[PDB]
């Protein structure tokens, strides 16, 4: 039955594999990457008329009928995203008259205007002179002086937040202004009567910070700020020490962009670091077939290659398949062997993790390290010395990274401080990196491959953590993937692998939940709204990936030979394309709950395969 689905899915995946032997699907986010790029180019005085044209095509193409832009496809209009897209276009050429510019302008107005957008948006606008700097939460160079164990030192923030904060402290330190030509000034972003509805600090504002901010803004005004020259040079130095191999910082868009702005502020355009940073940008860009161009928020090669392998194996290919080997060898050269920023909490831990992207040695993550190691543990390579070797370093590093509660975070250990969540500046997404159910589940499944189990103290501490986190309805939240369908699938699949008894009550209470959310069309789906309003948990249009996820939670808990189970397999079988692929016009990836969503291009192909591979196993 489904067997021709598996055969077609396989050959397809294999067609996607690059030569070097890895898979790499583009990462989808939202138009702010491109809009901010347009502005970075203006700031760095490096505008390419031809590029802008491809950009403008994309920006419009992405705009909706109502004239707004959202975070995920089919999502509510977003103010920040639309403001930034609006200014981006008006600068590229569009006149505030044109139908498209018209619609958006009226939406931005209906919302209270520029005064209702996040810090980043008002800050970007501050940079081109269309918004007062005095009204932007202040982050000072001096933060560089807080020691390792101090409230708010840069190591209390999550990896991604950290590097951005440092880059910005230099920029906010000088509060520079790169004027836009009159042609693109956007005063009209203020023309509204609607009351400005401002978003506050992610975790609630303490009148303390509010005051501290006001304090910092006045201080900024003095004629002399002692040791500030130093604070800066401490930041710049922190920056130059980490710049990734591809010229980026952390392999993510934000700190990368800010770090480049920062060197321009510091008159260092002709310094190796600035040059590598500038030209490394091109690797993240993507030429869209319909004429546009988009910039990736980050890149997922290692991650794609990792899942790719596991799916093709669970799906059937021999552990020594000449094509799967190209991948194994490739993954081995990827392992990171030097102290990262994680070393600050675990100095006697031996380097051995992996990154999400190509070259990013200072920021390996537990999620990637686990999937890559586990994946290797399923292949038979030529240099069995290295495979054995690599797997252990990664493994010992994963265990070394386990946080206090028994679960794993993404980049750091016990990055659970609650302090950063209240600063005025922090009003967008997560800012700390605490342990999550999904990353933890992926670790356990990994250990479980090697056979470790409920008997080992490390694994019990974890399962205790998962048991305590389980939601009332027996579902598990999905931190890096949308959402409860993602998390529950991950946990139940893991708990099954670490020997736990699939019959337990809390486990059953979970599968019931999964069978209970199947759409009429057989498959499962969960809309990104499930982070905002609970009435959406497990509800949403069916997707090949989210179906595949619910399928694993069932196949894992024994219910493989079920109705909902066989009904779901039908969905994947029916909806597959003639080439073996799958379509998925929705986002199933999560950047930050409620604020940033991602589209993982390979999920639609890999997971359906991995689920079908495991179904063909239960038989």
Ligand X SMILES: CCCCCCCCOCCOCCOCCOCCO
The binding site for ligand X (CB under 6 A) comprises 229, 232-233, 236, 241-242, 266, 268, 339, 341, 343-344, 362
Q: How far is the CB of 258 from ligand X (least distance, A)?
A: 16
Residue 276 within binding range of a copy of itself, rule CB under 8 A: yes
- Piece in contact with ligand R71 (CB under 6 A), picked from 270-278, 341-349, 364-372, 578-586: 364-372
State in angstroms the smallest separation of the CB of 132 from ligand X.
24
Task: Dihedral sign for Cα 350, 351, 352, 353, please.
Answer: positive
Separation in Å, CA 114 to CA 75, 109, 205, 446: 21, 8, 21, 47
CB 370 within 8 A of CB 424: no
**To the nearest whole angstrom, how small is the minimum distance from the Cβ of residue 276 to ligand R71?**
20
The two structure tokens encoding residue 172 = 């906010």
Q: What is the four-CA torsion angle of 419, 425, 426, 432, rounded to 10 degrees?
A: -50
Lookup: tokens for 189 = 């972003």
Task: Work out whether 271 is an interface residue with a copy of itself (CB under 8 A).
Answer: yes
Q: Is the peptide bond before 23 cis (omega within 30 degrees of 0)?
A: no
| Residue from the set 164, 377, 436, 493 that interacts with ligand R71 by CB under 6 A | 164
Q: Least distance (Å) from ligand R71 to the CB of residue 599?
A: 12
Catalytic entry in 78, 213, 365, 367: 367
Q: How far apart are alpha carbons 248 and 255 in whole angstroms?
A: 8
In eight-state DSSP terms, residue 65 is: T
For 287, phi then psi, to 5°, come to: -85, 110
Cβ nearer to ligand R71, comparing 55 with 297: 297
In which residue are the tokens 């403001």 written?
83
Indicate which of a copy of itself, ligand X, ligand R71, none lies near residue 160 (CB less than 5 to 8 Å, by partner kind): ligand R71
Handedness of CA 546, 252, 154, 394 (dihedral sign): positive
**Taking the complex as a whole, how short is the minimal distance between the CB of residue 581 and a copy of itself, in angstroms?**
35
Instruction: Count CB atoms within 10 A of the CB of residue 286.
Output: 16
- d(C-alpha 553, C-alpha 569), whole Å: 13
Instruction: Write down the least CB distance from residue 272 to a copy of itself, Å.
Output: 5
Are 523 and 571 in contact by the 8 Å Cβ rule? The answer is yes
* 428 lies in the binding site for ligand R71 (CB under 6 A): yes
Residue 307 touches which member of ligand R71, a copy of itself, ligand X, none, C-beta under 5-8 Å by kind: none
Considering the complex, state which of residue 41 and residue 275 has its C-beta at the smaller distance from a copy of itself.
275
Q: Report if residue 361 touches a copy of itself, rule: CB under 8 A.
A: yes
- Interface stretch with a copy of itself, choices 57-65, 269-277, 304-312, 496-504 (CB under 8 A): 269-277
What would the x/- binding string for a copy of itself be over residues 301 to 340, using CB under 8 A?
------------------------------------xx--
Closest to 296 in 3D by CA, of 276, 275, 282, 279: 282
Q: Are 518 and 582 in contact (CB under 8 A)?
A: no
**Would you state the structure tokens that stand for residue 452, as one six-digit string?**
């470790």
**For this structure, is 367 an active site residue?**
yes
* 295 lies in the site for ligand R71, by CB under 6 A: no
Catalytic residue numbers, as ranges: 367
Judged by the rule CB under 6 A, the positions of this chain that interact with ligand R71 are: 160-161, 164, 252-254, 297-298, 303, 356, 365, 367-368, 410, 428-429, 431, 480, 591, 596
Judged by the rule CB under 8 A, the positions of this chain that interact with a copy of itself are: 236-237, 240-241, 243-245, 247, 267-268, 270-273, 275-277, 337-338, 359, 361
């Amino acid at each position: 039955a489904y067997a021709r689905t598996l055969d077609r899915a396989v050959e397809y995946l294999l067609s996607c594999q690059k030569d070097e032997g890895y898979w790499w699907g583009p990462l989808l986010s939202n138009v702010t990457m491109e809009a901010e790029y347009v502005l970075l180019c203006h700031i760095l005085d490096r505008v390419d008329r031809d590029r802008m044209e491809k950009i403008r095509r994309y920006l419009l193409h992405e705009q909706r009928e109502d004239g707004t832009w959202a975070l995920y496809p089919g999502g509510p209009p977003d103010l920040d995203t639309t403001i930034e897209a609006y200014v981006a276009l008006k600068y590229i050429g569009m006149s505030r008259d044109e139908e498209p510019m018209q619609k958006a302008l009226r939406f931005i107005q209906s919302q209270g205007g520029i005064e209702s957008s996040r810090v980043f948006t008002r800050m970007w606008l501050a940079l081109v002179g269309e918004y007062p700097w005095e009204k932007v939460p202040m982050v000072p160079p001096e933060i560089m002086f807080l020691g390792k164990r101090m409230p708010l030192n840069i190591y209390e923030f999550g990896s991604w937040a950290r590097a951005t904060v440092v880059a910005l402290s230099i920029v906010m330190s000088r509060q520079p202004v790169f004027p836009l030509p009159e042609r693109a000034r956007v005063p009209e972003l203020y023309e509204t009567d609607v009351p400005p509805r401002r978003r506050g600090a992610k975790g609630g504002g303490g009148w303390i910070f509010d005051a501290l901010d006001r304090a910092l803004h006045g201080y900024q005004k003095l004629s002399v700020h002692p040791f500030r020259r130093a604070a800066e040079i401490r930041a710049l130095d922190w920056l130059l020490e980490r710049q990734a191999g591809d010229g980026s910082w952390g392999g993510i868009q934000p700190p990368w962009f800010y770090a480049l702005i920062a060197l321009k502020i510091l008159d260092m355009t002709q310094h190796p670091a600035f040059i590598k940073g500038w030209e490394g940008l091109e690797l993240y860009g993507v030429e869209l077939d319909y004429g546009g161009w988009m910039f990736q928020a980050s890149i997922s090669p290692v991650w794609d290659t990792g899942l790719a392998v596991l799916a093709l194996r669970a799906a059937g290919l021999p552990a020594d398949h000449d094509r799967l080997v190209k991948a194994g060898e490739w993954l081995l050269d990827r392992q990171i062997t030097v102290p990262g920023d994680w070393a600050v909490k675990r100095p006697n831990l031996k380097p051995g993790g992996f990154a999400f992207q190509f070259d990013n040695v200072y920021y390996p993550d537990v999620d990637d390290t686990a999937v890559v190691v586990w994946a290797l543990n399923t292949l038979r390579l030529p240099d069995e010395r290295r495979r054995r070797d690599a797997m252990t370093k990664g493994f010992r590093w994963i265990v070394g990274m386990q946080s206090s509660n028994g679960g794993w975070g993404a980049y750091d250990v016990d990055n659970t401080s609650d302090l950063p969540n209240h600063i005025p500046f922090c009003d967008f997404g997560e800012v700390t990196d605490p342990p999550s159910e999904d990353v933890t589940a992926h670790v356990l499944e990994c250990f479980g491959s090697f056979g470790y189990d409920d008997a080992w103290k490390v694994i019990r501490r974890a399962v205790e953590y998962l048991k305590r986190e389980q939601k009332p309805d027996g579902s598990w939240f999905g931190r890096w993937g949308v959402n409860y369908l993602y998390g529950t699938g991950a946990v139940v699949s893991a708990l099954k692998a670490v020997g736990i008894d699939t019959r337990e009550p809390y486990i059953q209470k979970a599968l019931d939940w999964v069978e209970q959310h199947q759409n009429p069309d057989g498959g499962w789906g969960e809309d990104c709204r499930s982070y905002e309003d609970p009435a959406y948990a497990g509800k949403g249009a069916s997707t090949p990936s989210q179906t595949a996820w619910a399928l694993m939670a069932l196949i894992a808990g024994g219910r493989a030979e079920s109705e909902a189970a066989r009904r779901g397999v039908q969905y994947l079988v029916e909806t597959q394309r003639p080439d073996g692929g799958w379509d998925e016009p929705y986002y199933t990836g999560t950047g930050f709950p409620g604020d940033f969503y991602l589209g993982y291009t390979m999920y639609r192909h890999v997971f359906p395969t991995l689920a079908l591979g495991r179904y063909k196993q239960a038989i």
